[PDB]
């Protein structure tokens, strides 16, 4: 879904991080009674951090302001409130990424040096040439004129692949 990401300023990049307050009803463990705060974070922490989620459709970079106090006049459950920060790239968005692993047919990028981005051969310039080297492999994709691929690449999101492990962006240099 989409709170549309505004492409803006002098970076021509579309900001994708959004702050999202949410209130949740969590299944507190028995082990964490008398201290549910540390409990809910074993519902929040590893659980969600750096791992894509569907209800908020994005990577949960981290939460801020956990307030368990959402209950106050035994006890299995509890209400709590927190603010998540979410990497929420959506189709059409204009992102930027560092060149990670390039290979004839499919260049690979790392957005913010941590999210998997890849553009298929189809989506590459076509006047860009891929030369192999002292590897045989040190292959490295140089453009028409001839500078080996820059280092940081501009590209538009064509799809975001949510699936079990690391989320993966499928982009195009049109």
Partner 1 sequence: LNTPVVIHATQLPQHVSTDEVLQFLESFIDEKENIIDIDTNLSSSISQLKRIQRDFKGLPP
Nearer to partner 1, 20 or 149 (CB): 20
- Shortest separation between residue 148's beta carbon and partner 1, angstroms: 21
CA atoms within 13 A on the CB side of 76: 1
Name, in order, each residue with C-beta under 8 angstroms of 80's C-beta and a sequence gap of 6 or more.
23, 24, 26, 36, 40, 66, 67, 68, 69, 70, 71
- Shortest separation between residue 27's beta carbon and partner 1, angstroms: 4
What does the chain come to in residues? 174
- Shortest separation between residue 120's beta carbon and partner 1, angstroms: 24
Query: Residue 174 to residues 22, 135, 170: CA-CA distances in angstroms?
Result: 37, 29, 12
Q: Is 138 exposed, middle or buried (0-12, 13-18, 19+ CB in 10 A)?
A: exposed
Nearer to partner 1, 90 or 130 (CB): 90
Nearer to partner 1, 47 or 148 (CB): 47
- Shortest separation between residue 91's beta carbon and partner 1, angstroms: 17
- Shortest separation between residue 31's beta carbon and partner 1, angstroms: 14
Nearer to partner 1, 88 or 123 (CB): 88
How far is the C-alpha of 98 from the C-alpha of 34, rounded, in Å?
46
Nearer to partner 1, 41 or 99 (CB): 41
How far is the C-alpha of 162 from the C-alpha of 99, rounded, in Å?
21
In the complex, the residues that contact partner 1 under the rule CB under 8 A are 3, 5-6, 10-11, 15, 17-27, 41-43, 45-46, 49-51, 55-56, 61-64, 81, 85-86, 88, 112-114
């Amino acid at each position: 879904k989409q709170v549309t990401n505004p492409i803006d300023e002098k970076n021509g990049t579309s900001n994708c991080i959004v702050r999202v307050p949410i209130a949740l009803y969590v299944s507190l463990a028995p082990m964490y009674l008398e201290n549910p705060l540390q409990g809910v974070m074993k519902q929040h922490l590893n659980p969600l951090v750096m791992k894509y989620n569907n209800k908020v459709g994005g990577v949960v970079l981290g939460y801020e302001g956990l307030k368990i106090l959402d209950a106050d006049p035994p006890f299995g459950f509890t209400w709590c409130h927190v603010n998540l920060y979410v990497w929420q790239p959506q189709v059409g968005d204009v992102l930027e990424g560092y060149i990670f692993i390039q290979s004839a047919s499919h260049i690979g990028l790392l957005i913010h040096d941590a999210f998997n981005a890849s553009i298929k051969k189809n989506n590459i310039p076509v006047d860009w040439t891929f030369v192999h080297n002292d590897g045989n492999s040190l292959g490295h994709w140089v453009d028409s004129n001839g500078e080996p691929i820059d280092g940081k690449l501009r590209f538009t999101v064509r799809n975001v692949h949510t699936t079990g492990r690391v989320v993966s962006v499928d982009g195009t240099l049109i």
